[PDB]
RNA sequence: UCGGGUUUCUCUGCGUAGGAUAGGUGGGAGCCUGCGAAACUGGCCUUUUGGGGUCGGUGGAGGCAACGGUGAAAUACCAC
């Protein structure tokens, strides 16, 4: 079990919000290693539609627990600003043998301006149907491979949606303070209540609840 | 007896590849001795291709997820 001290301070019943829970966060945790806490949401509008799958990006403010991930597929003054800064797997177009050979845990496929067309001509049978690759209107497109990489860098980007109604981005991880475990909880109703295209329901944000690895829930109040 | 809701206790969920229904994000490798995992024979909830729970004879007690296998995402340990 190993329940107690841990769910006698916790009731589902009351709230804690953004500058009480996060210092009581913390603490839901004390389990082994390092402890992270989850922060839910529910995008329970009409979750059987597909014009109400939210298909956009969140970037993370400070700097999480990880690296970068961003496979460039580049060639010439283009090696020298991927590989002397902290991208993933930079080169040239030998990236098509490492992204078609049975290597596709990467994120971020990146490319030049004028060799899009190896992206989109080789990997159009393979990468084709990833939606994981540099569009002219996205994130990664042009000679901005350090700046808006840095949106990839700057902020565990991600994005994904279901059909139940749970929506839950994560804030990081609790090696941080209680300012910034709602400072990266800053950047979660600042990346995830901007999902309304053309049809919606009567009130969004209908309350909010936790998770770790041993839980529980105090449910998060909303308001000022 | 029919109406529905709430709340607790309970489970289905193979259009694709995957040995064997993966149901989701994080702590994604450890503790678990404090709340429904193997597949022989006249089974129901899913419907006589295989798959959790089986009434009874039959009676090796420690383990797995995985690297691999593999999809924009994997099959277990705590949970919304």
Do not use: W
Request: zero cysteines.
């Amino acid at each position: 079990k190993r329940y107690r001290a841990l769910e006698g301070k916790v009731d589902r019943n009351k709230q804690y919000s953004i500058d009480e829970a996060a210092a009581l966060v913390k603490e839901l945790a004390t389990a082994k290693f390092d402890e992270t806490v989850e922060v839910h949401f529910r995008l329970g509008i009409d979750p059987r539609k597909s014009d109400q799958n939210v298909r956009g990006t969140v970037a993370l403010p400070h700097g999480t627990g990880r690296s970068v991930r961003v496979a460039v597929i580049t060639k010439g003054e283009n090696v020298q600003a991927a590989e002397a800064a902290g991208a993933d797997v930079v080169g040239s177009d030998e990236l098509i043998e490492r992204i078609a050979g049975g290597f596709m845990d990467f994120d971020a496929v990146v490319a030049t301006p004028d060799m899009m067309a190896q992206i989109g001509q080789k990997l159009a049978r393979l990468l084709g149907p990833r939606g994981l690759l540099p569009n002219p209107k996205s994130g990664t497109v042009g000679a901005d491979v350090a700046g808006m990489v840095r949106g990839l860098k700057a902020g565990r980007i991600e994005f994904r949606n279901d059909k139940t109604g749970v929506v839950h981005a994560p804030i990081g991880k609790a090696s941080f303070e209680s300012g910034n475990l709602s400072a990266n909880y800053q950047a979660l109703i600042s990346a995830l209540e901007g999902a309304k295209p053309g049809t919606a329901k009567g009130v969004f944000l209908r309350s909010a609840y936790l998770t770790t690895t041993m839980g529980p829930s105090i449910p998060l109040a909303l308001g000022g």
